[PDB]
Ligand binder design. Structure first.
Ligand SMILES: Nc1nc2c(ncn2[C@@H]2O[C@H](COP(=O)(O)OP(=O)(O)O)[C@@H](O)[C@H]2O)c(=O)[nH]1
Length: 408
């Protein structure tokens, strides 16, 4: 009953769909728009240290004020690396999804994602892990040591023709925020720690120059077709005790002061309620229920020998987008009907049951049609017709359950 990391993508690659569904289709979050914060990068680069502070912020927020902690008390990690073979490639998420009220009262679900791979441009693939993580997250925090290297940028080539395809055919950038998190920044006299120094440094690194390799200048020329926002944050060194310790357990006061300072800017910048950014695809928000569909559609196309064609990535996106609309409509029909004739609630005469059915079927189909969907009308119809068959089967079970409560 204790929260912990859940392996959702593992070694080709497999989606553990049951484990992911058990988190995302919980009753209290499945209908909420979901915020998906991913930290991605090479093994042993401090990703889980940052994930731990994000959890401290989220748990402090859940139960309140000094999120950083008590300076006298030792730190304890949250066990993102507790399993066998911690250097393994894959994607984990935290088992506790948080519910946060944004200003004005809208409640959203907040998922934390741990994306680990070799991250080195050669022989094998973890590009699959970076792609799946990027396409499903709303903030991809790309965790790098000391600088943004040309190798680092070359790994974004995965998305370049995808971004160019989507702009050309759907008139929209496919992804939201990419943030370069530069660890152990050592030149504050050139670019100061934090966000303003980071954006000046990123601007310089993103400039195309004739000596760079062709593929890297490509990435520079099209990264802004992929992400609606590209940002960078320079974080200081945490101090030698953190750097040289396996499983750091020293007191908060033993962490370097400038690191703590910049942590208090970085973590709220990502997780403060006014900053939470719901996942969006095709310009419409994704719920925990819908997010499951994107994982299921994306795992399929990354099964092959080679990386998928961009047309197949757009195709999988369109299919999952319509399935997400259908699933949301199906839940509306089911929840309303179960409220009215489910359980041991009293028998309803066929006239009353039919009327309720007609009311909630129309509600459900209207919701599907009103929802913004990719593919055009003929593409979306096949999903609508599928939804109508599901509703018909649901209605039959509701009718047979209702009839079992009849007297004689
Ligand atoms: N130099 C440095 N070391 C860090 C930082 N954050 C964590 N560490 C240490 O680096 C090692 C690997 O950290 P870990 O968070 O497990 O890396 P992960 O594999 O990316 O999750 C551990 O000894 C950490 O205590 C940092 O910002 N800078």
């Amino acid at each position: 009953s204790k929260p912990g990391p859940v392996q959702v993508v593992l070694v080709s690659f497999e989606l553990d769909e049951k484990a992911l569904a058990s988190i995302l289709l919980q009753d209290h979050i499945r209908d909420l728009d979901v915020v998906v914060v991913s930290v991605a990068g090479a093994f042993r680069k401090g990703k889980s240290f940052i994930l731990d502070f994000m959890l401290r912020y989220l748990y402090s927020q859940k139960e309140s004020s000094n999120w950083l902690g008590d300076p006298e008390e030792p730190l304890t990690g949250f066990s993102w690396r507790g399993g066998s073979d911690p250097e393994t490639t894959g994607i984990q998420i935290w088992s506790e999804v948080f519910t946060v009220e944004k200003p004005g009262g809208k409640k959203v679900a907040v998922v934390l994602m741990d994306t680990q791979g070799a991250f080195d441009s050669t022989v094998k693939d973890c590009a699959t892990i970076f792609a799946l993580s990027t396409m499903t997250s709303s903030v991809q925090i790309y965790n790098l040591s000391q600088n943004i290297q040309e190798d680092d940028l070359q790994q974004l080539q995965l998305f370049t023709e995808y971004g160019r395809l989507a702009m050309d055919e759907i008139f929209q950038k496919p992804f939201q925020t990419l943030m370069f998190l530069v660890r152990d920044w050592s030149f504050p006299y050139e670019y100061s720690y934090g966000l303003q120094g980071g954006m000046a440094f990123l601007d310089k690194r993103l400039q195309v120059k004739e000596h760079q390799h062709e593929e890297i200048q490509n990435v520079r020329n099209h990264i802004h077709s992929c992400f609606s926002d590209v940002t960078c944050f320079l974080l200081p060194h945490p101090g030698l005790q953190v750097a040289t310790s396996p499983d750091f357990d020293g007191k908060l006061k033993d962490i370097a002061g400038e690191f703590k300072e910049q942590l208090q800017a970085l973590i709220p910048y990502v997780l403060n309620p006014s900053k939470l950014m719901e996942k969006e695809i095709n310009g419409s928000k994704v719920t925990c229920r819908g997010l499951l569909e994107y994982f299921k559609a994306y795992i399929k196309i990354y099964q092959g020998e080679d990386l998928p064609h961009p047309k197949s990535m757009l195709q999988a996106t369109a299919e999952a987008n319509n399935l997400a609309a259908a699933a949301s409509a199906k839940d509306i029909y089911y929840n309303n009907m179960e409220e009215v004739c489910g359980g041991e609630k009293p028998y309803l005469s066929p006239d009353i049951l039919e009327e309720k059915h007609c009311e909630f079927k129309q509600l459900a189909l209207d919701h599907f049609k009103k929802t913004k969907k990719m593919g055009g009308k003929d593409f979306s119809f096949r999903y609508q017709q599928e939804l109508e068959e599901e509703i018909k089967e649901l209605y039959e079970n509701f009718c047979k359950h209702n009839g079992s409560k009849n007297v004689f």
